Design a protein around this nucleic acid. Structure first.
Ligand SMILES: [Mg+2]
Ligand SMILES: [Mg+2]
Ligand SMILES: [Mg+2]
Ligand SMILES: [Mg+2]
Ligand SMILES: [Mg+2]
Ligand SMILES: [Mg+2]
Ligand SMILES: [Mg+2]
Ligand SMILES: [Mg+2]
Ligand SMILES: [Mg+2]
Ligand SMILES: [Mg+2]
Ligand SMILES: [Mg+2]
Ligand SMILES: [Mg+2]
Ligand SMILES: [Mg+2]
Ligand SMILES: [Mg+2]
Ligand SMILES: [Mg+2]
Lengths: 81, 129, 216, 96, 97, 25, 206, 121, 87
RNA sequence: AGGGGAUCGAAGAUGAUCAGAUACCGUCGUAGUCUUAACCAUAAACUAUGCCGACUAGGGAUCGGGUGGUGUUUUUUUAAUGACCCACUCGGCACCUUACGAGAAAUCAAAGUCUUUGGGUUCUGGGGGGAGUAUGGUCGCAAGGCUGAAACUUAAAGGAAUUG
């Protein structure tokens, strides 16, 4: 293809492309508000945490760091904020 | 590394018009690129171009017609006087009737014939035909 | 007689196409030299040189002759043919045929001021065949052709009055430098200019205008 | 970037590079070393007078069978011995 | 000139490969350059198989095979008709017959 | 002749010249 | 534009999905094909049969634009398309070249099979690559019954289709003949169907 | 060897193209009509041509031979290639379709009898 | 182009590609000129009534001739939903 | 310079071959081959292709990381994993097809965007020999390394391909 609209690419292609190779670059990560069982004490956690984030109420580790997205523990209820 | 953003822009435009495409994505969109594109657009060599503002340096999407043969840059930006503009044009323009040597003077970025009309010279940026 | 076998040959024998401008406009492939000597009767030929080539065999060296011929009329049209043959006059004849088949037009222009008739080329133009690269620069009036003898006569048969030339490479390779100058003058009508920026209504082909006085 | 520097403040690099690559030539190196002034019999002059010592029958190179009728001559200004070819036919009978 | 784009071996990104020895002449050749074949063969050479089957104390016998990985240098591989000289066109054929 | 053995021969020559010059030096 | 009677009828769609023209190539995909729609599981892709119909009626307009129909050439080296191009040549002018395309048919003006066509129609550009290559020498447009992986070089009108099926090639040639006859006016009933069955343009093993 | 040249082969196949119903599977009768039907300077060449025509007739009696195409052969060829079945092969005998084909036709906005079956990897 | 007082010169003003606006040379033997017939109110094509599209040898050899023709046809209205600008 | 020194094995010795054979083949066999502490600074040390940066044709595969998919399998039928499959993405070693392009060609997705000659920068070459020689420095225990001419001589050497 030699004629195409570069200013309005389609959502599929821009979500397919790398986060730096889009038209305007932006993060693909997000934030969650997580509840652990027990203390209500909702807490906001990054997608790619890099730390064993626990609630400030108790040592109740919510996510474990991984190479990419953090792995949430089994007893957790998260919402994509 | 990336030393001349104007050179990268003009090389991308040259490759695009060689391949026959009607559009090209330019990065990273400086002021001299804007003024160079404005001169080419005023003389009718490209068409409409649009500046995408990200907060880093900007991108530019130019629309390419079929009229551009070669847009080139001159590196380094030589200091060019009034005899020097005609000997330069005789060297690197295809004819004496069309094509423009673009040069940054203290009175803005413009082409050699407008520099002749205003009677002022400066540094040479590039050329277009 | 001629008895052509081509839609184009039948049309030009019928007289529907009376100049080569239609052929050059529609890029029609010419395959009969009688079309060319009908539509351009006033072109003259000239054979540049005859070099002998040789192929080694188990019994001696089979030798044949390579003749390069340039046909042309002194306003706008040239053709270049190169033929090898066992006999030199047959090589010249068939090279004349090939040169007539390979006729291209020339975009003559002005060095400045567009006052009289087009004396020079419109733009700088180059060509390259082999290592030889031949450049052609538009020259002022009265400058004459500043070139070697061979490509000077080629440009004289083209119809250019004055042009500056720069060559590079083994210019003693005559076939290569002649083909390079031929490509250089052919690229003139490849260059797009501000006077050609304007659009045209795309005229329809004679091969469908005159479709019934074509093949059947 | 085609090798060589292109910066506007890089004339010295180009000058010394051109000086070395000029020394790489033949005529420039010869003219600057002065081999005509030092290692030439004529000392750089166009002509030179000398005193004939003897007559030689110098053979032509191959493929050519001939005797070229040259002479041994000692130059006056240098004292150097030099072989000079007497050009035409029978002119060896003038230079005894 | 350059005959092969791969220089007659398989080395793109190493710099050095430890050599092996030709099984026929003991020439040192890099392991990527050799002409590795695999001789998998029955031990009885297919003519005594009936005699050994009727002389075996067991029925149902497996009659095992011997396996060797043979490494040949270019000279021995050519001389032993393993590989042969191919045309300039079919030199690029990568697939086995 | 082969360049490797030409190099070897001129190296032996250089060694012999070194020793015949060190005789006087 | 068109008076909207040229839209894809459900009967033609029944024919198309019966011949499985929609079941295009595998996940192999030349990037010059945006006719693809909704890549199926099993690694196969589905073609926009509306787009195939639009390209087919465009090709029918181009064929009807020719003054002399015999200056159209139907090419099929494929056994699945030989009967199709023969019946296309029977129902239109459209001189056929089925089987082996001898080189020098468009060049080499002294050949006995020397044609001077104004338009060439091929079945597969990969198998008929000699014909499109020769057409690139003498300024001839090409219409090709392309697939989603076909070599679209030197192709000017690409009709996307499953050119590996027996029924699909014959259906495409049948619909092309029907539409060009409708545009010529030999088939005056644009709404009423054709008396010719689409099975007539099919390959048989005997 | 007994390889026959292209003059014999071409004359034989031409005789078969334009005289197939006339000539038969016997060398003697084929010879007696070949000398009548063509001018051949040699009795030996006439006999060679008649023998190859008889051989090719033997070949024709067991399936068609490639290259030879006479009027009877080509007329039965066209009489067989004008074959059309009674019912269409594309006529609906019940049509089966996939989910992707169903959403294709619903996006095109056409209603037709379709049967969706799951196509799993 | 022309000289000082009208009086046109430059025999053979050439054709330009409908896709790239580049000059189709006198020997670009891969270039084509598509003629698409017009229809008027009955479903039948009128002879001699064409829309013309010139395609150059470069864009034809590079394989985008069909996409260029698609967008040209959709711009001239004789195609409806085949070409999409936002790729 | 110590240790180790099984194999193989410059030199050497022998047995063959040969007109000769202090060569190829065979048998022994020293230094070496291995290691420690120091030196040496070379190689067809090759991709015979300097680095950084941008753009420019398609195709699939693979390595490492990541994303998604009610996808498959295993566990405790079932979770999470892991291993696979599909789609995508970043970074690699590469490969296949073509030539818009380049090139003297062989060939090259770089050897392209180079007479329409300028993105930044480093190094090297100027016909062939003499010659990487002589000399002078400098490094090295030495072997040698780095730097490095001239006289003289010559019309060709040379590259890639073609038919024999
Ligand atoms: Mg020169
Ligand atoms: Mg500077
Ligand atoms: Mg000589
Ligand atoms: Mg060799
Ligand atoms: Mg190495
Ligand atoms: Mg020994
Ligand atoms: Mg070295
Ligand atoms: Mg090196
Ligand atoms: Mg790079
Ligand atoms: Mg991966
Ligand atoms: Mg990868
Ligand atoms: Mg890697
Ligand atoms: Mg030199
Ligand atoms: Mg030299
Ligand atoms: Mg050679």
């Amino acid at each position: 293809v030699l004629v195409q609209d570069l200013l309005h690419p389609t959502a599929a292609s821009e979500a397919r492309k790398h986060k730096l190779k889009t038209l305007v670059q932006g993060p693909r990560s997000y934030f969650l508000d997580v509840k652990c069982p027990g203390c209500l004490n909702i807490t906001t956690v990054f997608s790619h945490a890099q730390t064993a984030v626990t609630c400030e109420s108790c040592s109740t580790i919510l996510c474990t760091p991984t190479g990419g997205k953090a792995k949430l523990s089994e007893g957790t209820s998260f919402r994509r904020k | 590394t990336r030393s001349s953003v104007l050179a990268d822009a003009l090389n991308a435009i040259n490759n695009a018009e060689k391949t026959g495409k009607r559009q090209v994505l330019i990065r990273p969109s400086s002021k001299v690129i804007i003024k160079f594109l404005q001169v080419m657009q005023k003389h009718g060599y490209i068409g409409e171009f649009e500046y995408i503002d990200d907060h880093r340096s900007g991108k530019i999407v130019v629309q390419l017609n079929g009229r551009l043969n070669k847009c080139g840059v001159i590196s380094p930006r030589f200091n060019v006087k009034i005899g020097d503009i005609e000997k330069w044009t005789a060297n690197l323009l295809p004819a004496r009737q069309f094509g423009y040597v673009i040069l940054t003077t203290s009175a803005g970025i413009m082409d050699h014939e407008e520099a002749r009309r205003k009677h002022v010279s400066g540094k040479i940026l590039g050329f277009v035909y | 007689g001629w008895v052509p076998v081509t839609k184009l040959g039948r049309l030009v024998k019928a007289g529907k196409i009376t100049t080569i401008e239609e052929i050059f406009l529609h890029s029609l492939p010419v395959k009969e030299f009688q079309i060319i000597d009908t539509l351009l009767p006033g072109l003259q030929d000239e054979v540049m040189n005859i070099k002998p080539v040789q192929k080694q065999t188990r019994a001696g060296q089979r030798t044949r002759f390579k003749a390069v011929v340039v046909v042309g009329d002194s306003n706008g049209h040239v053709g270049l043919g190169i033929k090898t043959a066992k006999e030199v006059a047959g090589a010249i004849r068939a090279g004349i045929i090939i040169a007539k088949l390979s006729v291209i037009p020339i975009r003559r222009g002005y060095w400045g001021t567009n006052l009289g008739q087009p004396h020079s080329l419109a733009t700088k133009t180059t060509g390259k065949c082999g290592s030889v690269t031949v450049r052609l620069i538009p020259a002022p009036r009265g400058s004459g052709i500043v070139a070697s003898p061979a490509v000077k006569k080629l440009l004289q048969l083209a119809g250019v009055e004055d042009v500056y030339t720069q060559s590079n490479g083994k210019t003693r390779t005559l076939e290569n430098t002649l083909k390079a100058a031929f490509v250089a003058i052919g690229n003139t009508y490849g260059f797009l200019t501000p006077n050609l920026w304007a659009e045209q209504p795309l005229p329809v082909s004679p091969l469908d205008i005159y479709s019934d006085e074509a093949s059947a | 970037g085609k090798g060589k520097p292109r910066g506007l403040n890089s004339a010295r690099k180009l000058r010394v590079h051109r000086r070395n690559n000029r020394w790489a030539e033949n005529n420039y190196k010869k003219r600057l070393l002065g081999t005509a002034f030092k290692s030439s019999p004529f000392g750089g002059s166009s002509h030179a007078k000398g005193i004939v010592l003897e007559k030689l029958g110098i053979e032509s190179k191959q493929p050519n069978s001939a005797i070229r009728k040259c002479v041994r001559v000692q130059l006056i200004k240098n004292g150097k011995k030099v072989t000079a070819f007497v050009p035409n036919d029978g002119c060896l009978n003038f230079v005894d | 000139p350059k005959k092969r784009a791969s220089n007659g071996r398989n080395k793109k990104g190493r710099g050095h490969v430890k050599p092996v020895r030709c099984v026929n002449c003991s020439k040192s050749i890099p392991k990527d350059k050799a002409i590795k074949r695999m001789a998998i063969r029955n031990i009885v050479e297919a003519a005594a198989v009936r005699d050994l089957s009727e002389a075996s104390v067991y029925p149902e016998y497996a009659l095992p095979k011997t396996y060797n990985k043979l490494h040949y240098c270019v000279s021995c591989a050519i001389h032993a008709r393993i590989v042969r000289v191919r045309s300039r066109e079919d030199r690029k054929n990568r697939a086995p017959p | 002749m082969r360049a490797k053995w030409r190099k070897k021969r001129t190296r032996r020559l250089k060694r012999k010249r070194r020793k015949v010059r060190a005789r006087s030096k | 534009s068109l008076p909207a009677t040229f839209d894809l009828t459900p009967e033609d769609a029944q024919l198309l999905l019966a011949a499985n023209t929609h079941l295009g190539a595998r996940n192999v995909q030349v990037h010059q094909e945006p006719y693809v729609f909704n890549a199926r599981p099993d690694g196969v892709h589905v073609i926009n049969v509306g787009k195939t119909w639009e390209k087919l009626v465009l090709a029918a307009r181009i064929i009807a634009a020719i003054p002399n129909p015999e200056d159209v050439v139907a090419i099929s080296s494929r056994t699945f398309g030989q009967r199709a191009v023969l019946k296309f040549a029977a129902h239109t002018g459209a001189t056929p070249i089925a089987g082996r395309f001898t080189p020098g048919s468009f060049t080499n003006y002294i050949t006995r099979s020397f044609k001077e066509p104004r338009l060439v129609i091929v079945t597969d550009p990969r198998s008929d690559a000699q014909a499109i290559k020769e057409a690139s020498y003498v300024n001839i447009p090409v219409i090709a019954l392309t697939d989603l992986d076909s070599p679209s070089e030197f192709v000017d009108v690409a009709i996307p289709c499953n050119n590996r099926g027996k029924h699909s090639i014959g259906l495409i040639w049948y619909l092309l003949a029907r539409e060009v006859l409708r545009l010529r006016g030999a088939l005056v009933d644009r709404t009423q169907p054709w008396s010719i069955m689409p099975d007539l343009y099919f390959y048989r093993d005997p | 060897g007994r390889v026959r040249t292209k003059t014999v082969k071409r004359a034989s196949k031409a005789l078969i193209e334009r005289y197939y119903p006339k000539l038969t599977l016997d060398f003697q009768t084929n010879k007696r009509l070949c000398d009548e039907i063509a001018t051949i300077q040699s009795k030996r060449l006439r006999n060679k041509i008649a023998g190859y025509t008889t051989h090719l007739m033997k070949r024709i009696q067991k399936g068609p031979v490639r290259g030879i195409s006479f009027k009877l052969q080509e007329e039965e060829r066209e009489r067989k290639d004008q074959y059309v079945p009674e019912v269409s092969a594309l006529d609906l005998s019940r049509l089966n379709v996939d989910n992707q084909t169903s959403d294709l036709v619903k996006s095109l906005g056409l209603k037709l009898p379709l049967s969706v079956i799951n196509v799993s990897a | 182009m022309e000289n000082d007082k009208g009086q046109l010169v430059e025999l053979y003003v050439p054709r330009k590609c409908s896709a790239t606006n580049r000059i189709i040379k006198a020997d670009d033997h891969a270039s084509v000129q598509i003629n698409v017939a017009k229809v008027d109110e009955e479903g039948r094509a009128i002879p001699g009534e064409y829309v013309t599209y010139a395609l150059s040898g470069y864009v034809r050899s590079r394989g985008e001739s069909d996409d260029s023709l698609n967008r040209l046809a959709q711009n001239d209205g004789l195609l409806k939903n085949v070409w999409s600008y936002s790729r």
